[model samples]
Target chain A: IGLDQIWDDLRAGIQQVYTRQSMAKSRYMELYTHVYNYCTSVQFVGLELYKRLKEFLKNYLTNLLKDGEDLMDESVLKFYTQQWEDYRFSSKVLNGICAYLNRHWVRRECDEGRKGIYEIYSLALVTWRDCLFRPLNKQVTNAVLKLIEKERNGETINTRLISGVVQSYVELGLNEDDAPTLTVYKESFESQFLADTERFYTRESTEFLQQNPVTEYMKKAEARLLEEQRRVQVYLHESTQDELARKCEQVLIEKHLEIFHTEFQNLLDADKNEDLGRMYNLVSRIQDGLGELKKLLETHIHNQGLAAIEKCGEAALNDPKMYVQTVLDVHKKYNALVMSAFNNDAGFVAALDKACGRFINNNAVTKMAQSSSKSPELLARYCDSLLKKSEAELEDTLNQVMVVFKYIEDKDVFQKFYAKMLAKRLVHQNSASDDAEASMISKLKQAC
Target chain B: PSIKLQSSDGEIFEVDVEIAKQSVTIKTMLEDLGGDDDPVPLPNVNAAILKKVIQWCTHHKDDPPPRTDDIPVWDQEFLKVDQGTLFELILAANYLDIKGLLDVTCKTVANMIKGKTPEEIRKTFNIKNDFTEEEEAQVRKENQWC
Candidate 1:
């Protein structure tokens, strides 16, 4: 049972890692392959899941930042800078993941039914801190350090790392209980029952009896009550989850906007004599913000969803399906926001600056005939024509791309509301408990 | 009373103290040195352009300080000068370290470069490309999809 569960988790993790890469084409190729291989090997050696996850994160994230630093061409850096604002949308996904966990997992039963709840909580924290705070701090520091050094002519200079990067984590931070936890198939939760079965004979079922007795009268009443309470609970939990999800999503979306506003203003204040290094740093940090959001979501999902369910309550035994559904919905919301942000801010005009680097280096493109035959004069005319072409193409592409952003409009808001839908789906599926595997797997499939 | 500023060509102009003080560089010098008895010698600005600059500054002296957030239309007409005179004016303003004059001049240059083709920009600015046919065409073709 453990093996089967671990296999499913490994699959989910790989899917997430690849999805982040596809969203923005800037991952370390080697790190991705290494992590992918490590994820596959985890099933064969199941004890080191925590270590593996951290090692993959540490190596992959570090490499991505280093690669970004090495390729500091102004254009690529600018593209990255613009993309960083999308982190607000990504933040919504993290909160959505948290909502799903709190509803179906943490508030309910564990797979060992009740015995493994404490262990799950510890595991969830490990996941949350790693996903939320650790990576963001590391990435922001990298961005700041790179900018400071750039201004110093690449001479090593260090500034006290500002806490603003971690500010996002704090603002979006989830209380484990309030986090959305997922419930998978009954068997996953059922394993907790198996592990705890020894207590069935040793510990008087007095504690169990205090809340729920095994008598015929009690069992019949329990069945009726589960059905009655579920409908009310589903609606209530979904509504409350949606409300919290919206708040969480809004805060995140604003963070990137705030950063852009501040940075742009800084440029305005700068003297002409001031170096362009700070401007470059601001732009690069904005780009790194995009990567930060995805890592945060991955952590939030595991900590708030799967771990919370196992650790929080014996709730998983009663309802596993609803929680997983909620997780899937939130994941979709996050991905949609990411896609929308990418399309909205494609900024073709900005991209022209980068392409020009290649254009100038090509040498072949500079051969155009101009009105003037004088070497330098004609060349300037030729270059001028090329610049015109670039400007026109940039405007045309930007006009077309802006048309696509309508799809992501209110995207962060949509993801938050979707979290509610996820929570409702999870609770409904759990209460029904009919063909739970098929129902839950369908939700997971939908996440893709 | 108007403060007197002497051009490098020895032409003297009398201008409002407010207008002359619009240049932060001049404002600071006035505060540190005291009095308007000594005529400010602007070595870089010739008589003709200095007259034009003082005329524009006098027109704007009563206006509020330029906004950090505001990109204004007030300077559009102020920048409508021939290329040679505009270039000299910008160099002069930059030397004087006048924030308003600097922004207007730079924005004028950016405006001239804004929508025109690279060739048009070159024609406007008189800058030579200095690339060979292969380099030039490569730049055009590569930048064609910009």
Candidate 2:
């Protein structure tokens, strides 16, 4: 292959490539072999080949994306991106065929501390960024955002196609040190994306909340936020993922933290564990969001706690079974509530425990009976009644009996009552089973 | 379902998203970073070898592991190729870090090496013993132990 014919063959072969014309596999191979000979010659044409090809691609980019300018928005992205996807496929094909050139010429030049040199595919991407996208990026991004906007309005659109344009923003970036960092990606697409996200959710949530209960509003906010997460997985640069979430939360959740908290109190009051759980998940996104809700939950539970024992009238309070059973029943409701609704979250669990502690020790029910919580005496007498009639799985009842009993602040009072009951049951031979008696005694000794 | 892969010889092939995840290299480039779109460039492998790798992964995609003393009959039948291709697959297996592929290919090599004496082993593998003529005589004379 002489110099003139060599470049003539390649220039035409490359023309077929950029024009999206399929040549024979034999023809593709012939051109590859020609590139090999051209590079390995004593007087190699690597630099000349590089320069001529660069010039052609630069000219090709200009000819290519300009055709889309005559088209309107959606059509513009589809066609502009049509060339992008087509051109990218062609670029990868060329990259593989030119492995020898890269392994030798590209490798040697870059290893010699050269700059501005790249693998064929990398050079194609860079030129597209510089020549095509740099000139027309604004239009492409605006069109993409419009597609996203339509989706946000609940109209289904082609997500993959949208991602094609969005990901191109990432594909076009090159940093000063020649790596692809995210400044081009962030500034060009996400800056506006984040702003539009804030604005979009701001309006939707304001309208949705006004029209529906905050419970319904909470469900919508979670779906929107979760949808945003999946959308990023679908197309958006992962670098934009967290930033996108922040904006959605700001508009949908944190923007109404006060209202969310108010509804939280209502949910707790109504015992709407399902809605409360939804609120818990959504509000947890903010730094200060869950802080107030926890204290509010603590107080509501405390109020419910006292109310449980309050319903124990004078007759109900006369017996150990009735009094202790009331306390245990209420504790069961709260324990189940905390675990199911709050996910047994640590802070909420602590709040639930604290509320139980206060009601157990300082409630009117206890104060009226013995002027102390009297809970210690009541719990001990309950333990005695259990041994006198305990089942193997009184077991379940017996263990749960200890749950609220463990919260007793003055167990010294409990120990005195427990000791007297233990002695009375044993001497009177009133216990249902000695094994039951032994098990209860061991539990009491260990807890004390 | 996921990305296309480009062989070094300029051919592109589509991969099953879950199937190709067996390749740690492909997984990192596609999922750990994420792209089911771009044609991921595999610079070291040519189309012929890459095609073989894809076939193996496709067959073993839902696989667990295997015993080392012998490969499953499926693996044994799959690895039946010329030594040159077998060697290439070994490099491919290591580069992709698919232990399932690697362990079977490695066991195949051991199977061939077993029961072949030193001279036959060298010939079977095309490996030179590097016992040069000058070093050869002294080595045999002094090192002729049981």
Candidate 3:
């Protein structure tokens, strides 16, 4: 038989494949041998068979998808996907039958001027894309979006079906400059999905912030972000993971970040570490989001330390230990806050050190009372209590005083007072441990 | 069991399994051809170079695998041979796919090339200066900034 009769028999065999009837392996070999002999018989019939096979696949798959246009959007998507799978399987078999023509004629055609000539099976895909998907793509995109909306509304839908539908956009790509670029799925499905997410989260966040407290709002925002993260893996393209997460973050956090500033004091006053950590988690996604929280924390610490300083009245001279205890206690409390609540971020630690330094050297006390010049002297005496008299862990006490020592800017003043105090303690034989004193001086030298 | 290595000049040398396995090429052949007791042919290396490579491998047989970039003192002393012998050792090590010997040999060659004038290097390696006058001047002008 000629090309027409052989193509007719090949189509009938392909139909058996689509309807799921098992063809014998020997029968498949027989069809392959027919295609091989026809392409090589010097009869000049290869091009005719190629064109007729392409046209047949185009018309067949188009009619298959067109038959489902009258169904509901859900079934319409399912029907199109069913036909796509059937076409994929059938074209793979057709490619096997026509392997000779693919190896010889297609390569020659590609070398001549058809720069992006696909293989026999891939040509079937391109044909289906041009004949079927291009016209119904808008409807298919809408059906995917609607199904996603149904899933977003807390109704369970088939994630595999959505993945399969989106997978087609990647597989059957658009032609650009005679090459296939898979941006159709990104533009049609992923962009619409992200825009819908932005809209959904914007309205949900506004309503959520109004109905709940800040803590509950943060918790719900965390949960929504986590769900979006999982959604990307289930139905979205892998490349859309970062872009979709950024969209969720923009709508949920960056759009309403001022609420964190207004409730900054309350979050700290309640010692809400988890809530603050959650806020940190969300804000750190944006550039410099944590910077504002850091500024407010510094201001809070500075004010608290100054209040403690002002409460230390004439006791600054009469009881230098009590006055120093008040200042060091404030430093200790905030250092703990930065460690436990702030994830020990370097910026927060630096801010804590700066705030402690400001109150320790405020000099407002020096103008208000005559005994305030004795503040550094009092700090020196406090160090003496920790190192010389306090029968506690030497290394622990030495480290505790070093935290305060770092806050004092005029180290010469503290060092002079400390040297005097050490001289008195050493000369009078009141030193607690000579070994500890030597170690303390060495640590101070290293710090310098 | 021992492994037999047949050099290109038809010299067969016997060595321990653990020592011979340092060359990954020999290790793979031994694995694929498993316990065949045949003399593995090294057609790229002759008897002289093969014996020297085996000497280095057997001496360092018990040392741990080379992970750091530094060549140990014994390997450094072993690689301090005449230029022809050193190049032949490099070729044999590269052909045998012994990573440690290749690294030390290349490092020894690099150290020799450093700090020598171009004329001296050409004399040492017997290399021909094939650049045209304009190309040589352009290269010198490019190096003026350094």
- The digit string of per-residue lDDT tens for model 1 on A165-195 reads 2223233334333223322111222233223
Output DockQ, candidate 3.
0.01
Best model per DockQ: 2
Each candidate's interface RMSD (Å, one decimal) is 27.3, 11.0, 18.8
Docking category for candidate 1?
A: incorrect
* Interface DockQ of each model: 0.00, 0.03, 0.01
TM-score of each: 0.23, 0.67, 0.70
Return the top candidate by lDDT.
2
Q: Could you tell which candidate, 1 or 3, scores higher by lDDT?
A: 3
lDDT of 3 by residue, A29-107 (tens): 4566566557756465637777777677667766665566666678777876776776676666666556667766788
TM-score, structure 2 vs. true? 0.67
Residue pairs with colliding backbones in model 3 are none
lDDT of each: 0.41, 0.74, 0.73
Query: lDDT-based ranking, best first?
Result: 2, 3, 1
Candidate 1 on B47-122: residue-level lDDT in tens? Answer: 9889878877777666676324255665676667688888888866754456677777776777667888978988
**Cα miss at A333, model 1 (Å)?**
78
TM-scores of chain A across candidates: 0.19, 0.84, 0.90
